[PDB]
Design an enzyme around this catalytic site. Sequence first.
Site, PDB file in Angstrom:
ATOM      1  N   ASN A  84       1.425 -27.791  -3.240  1.00  0.00           N
ATOM      2  CA  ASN A  84       1.151 -26.704  -3.092  1.00  0.00           C
ATOM      3  C   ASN A  84       2.758 -25.781  -3.170  1.00  0.00           C
ATOM      4  O   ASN A  84       3.909 -26.235  -3.597  1.00  0.00           O
ATOM      5  CB  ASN A  84       0.877 -26.161  -1.537  1.00  0.00           C
ATOM      6  CG  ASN A  84      -0.199 -26.795  -0.766  1.00  0.00           C
ATOM      7  OD1 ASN A  84      -1.016 -26.466  -1.594  1.00  0.00           O
ATOM      8  ND2 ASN A  84      -0.251 -27.660   0.772  1.00  0.00           N
TER       9      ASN A  84
ATOM     10  N   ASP B 148       4.637 -23.892  -1.204  1.00  0.00           N
ATOM     11  CA  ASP B 148       5.353 -24.042  -0.393  1.00  0.00           C
ATOM     12  C   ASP B 148       6.154 -25.678  -0.772  1.00  0.00           C
ATOM     13  O   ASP B 148       7.469 -25.698   0.368  1.00  0.00           O
ATOM     14  CB  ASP B 148       4.979 -23.606   0.887  1.00  0.00           C
ATOM     15  CG  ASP B 148       4.633 -24.357   1.207  1.00  0.00           C
ATOM     16  OD1 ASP B 148       3.830 -24.489   2.368  1.00  0.00           O
ATOM     17  OD2 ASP B 148       3.819 -25.606   0.557  1.00  0.00           O
TER      18      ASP B 148
ATOM     19  N   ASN C 163      -2.662 -30.687   4.944  1.00  0.00           N
ATOM     20  CA  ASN C 163      -1.919 -30.262   4.077  1.00  0.00           C
ATOM     21  C   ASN C 163      -1.242 -30.482   4.959  1.00  0.00           C
ATOM     22  O   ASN C 163      -1.140 -30.897   6.026  1.00  0.00           O
ATOM     23  CB  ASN C 163      -1.893 -28.496   4.631  1.00  0.00           C
ATOM     24  CG  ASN C 163      -0.697 -28.256   3.806  1.00  0.00           C
ATOM     25  OD1 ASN C 163      -0.089 -28.898   3.268  1.00  0.00           O
ATOM     26  ND2 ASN C 163      -0.816 -26.342   3.415  1.00  0.00           N
TER      27      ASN C 163
ATOM     28  N   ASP D 211      -1.535 -30.992  -0.525  1.00  0.00           N
ATOM     29  CA  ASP D 211      -2.432 -31.678   0.754  1.00  0.00           C
ATOM     30  C   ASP D 211      -3.162 -33.022   0.290  1.00  0.00           C
ATOM     31  O   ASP D 211      -2.813 -33.794  -1.639  1.00  0.00           O
ATOM     32  CB  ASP D 211      -3.746 -30.471  -0.368  1.00  0.00           C
ATOM     33  CG  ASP D 211      -3.683 -28.957   0.358  1.00  0.00           C
ATOM     34  OD1 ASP D 211      -2.564 -28.954   1.583  1.00  0.00           O
ATOM     35  OD2 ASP D 211      -3.612 -28.763   0.026  1.00  0.00           O
TER      36      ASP D 211
ATOM     37  N   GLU E 166     -12.930 -29.676  -2.153  1.00  0.00           N
ATOM     38  CA  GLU E 166     -12.165 -30.320  -2.528  1.00  0.00           C
ATOM     39  C   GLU E 166     -11.415 -31.405  -3.264  1.00  0.00           C
ATOM     40  O   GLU E 166     -10.102 -31.241  -3.891  1.00  0.00           O
ATOM     41  CB  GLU E 166     -11.419 -30.303  -1.450  1.00  0.00           C
ATOM     42  CG  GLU E 166     -11.045 -28.862   0.354  1.00  0.00           C
ATOM     43  CD  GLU E 166     -10.284 -27.923  -0.539  1.00  0.00           C
ATOM     44  OE1 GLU E 166     -10.020 -28.328  -0.078  1.00  0.00           O
ATOM     45  OE2 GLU E 166     -10.569 -27.271   0.612  1.00  0.00           O
TER      46      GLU E 166
ATOM     47  N   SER F 238       5.094 -28.428   0.273  1.00  0.00           N
ATOM     48  CA  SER F 238       3.960 -29.075   0.783  1.00  0.00           C
ATOM     49  C   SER F 238       2.788 -29.665   0.232  1.00  0.00           C
ATOM     50  O   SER F 238       2.905 -29.155  -1.080  1.00  0.00           O
ATOM     51  CB  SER F 238       3.206 -28.626   2.363  1.00  0.00           C
ATOM     52  OG  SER F 238       2.271 -27.085   1.594  1.00  0.00           O
TER      53      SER F 238
END
Length: 129
Positions: A46, A48, A59, A52, A35, A50
Amino acid sequence: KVFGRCELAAAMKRHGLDNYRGYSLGNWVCAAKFESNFNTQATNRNTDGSTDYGILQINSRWWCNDGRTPGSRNLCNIPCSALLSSDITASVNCAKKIVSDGNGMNAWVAWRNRCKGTDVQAWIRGCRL
């Protein structure tokens, strides 16, 4: 902070992740490797809108507040910036809530695609725990 493999394993064990909800320690180290490359300062946007955050790439859509994800939740009740600290306590505490929410570690795409079903014990070999 960029953790060493055994350094992170020991920190995660101290914070109670070994066998948390049935996931042995190597699962958590493996997920952190793919990750964030063990980097507490990792961020990734992301599609959309958002973002991380941190060593476990948590998230903002559900788990933390960054002030720029409209219509999102803050289920861990923390600012997302707290997840970038050299102290992994906030990330571990929030990860415990995520993994309990029903889908286990499948919440982490990299765990599902690169750790699940593999010999994850290899990630803690040689470590003094």
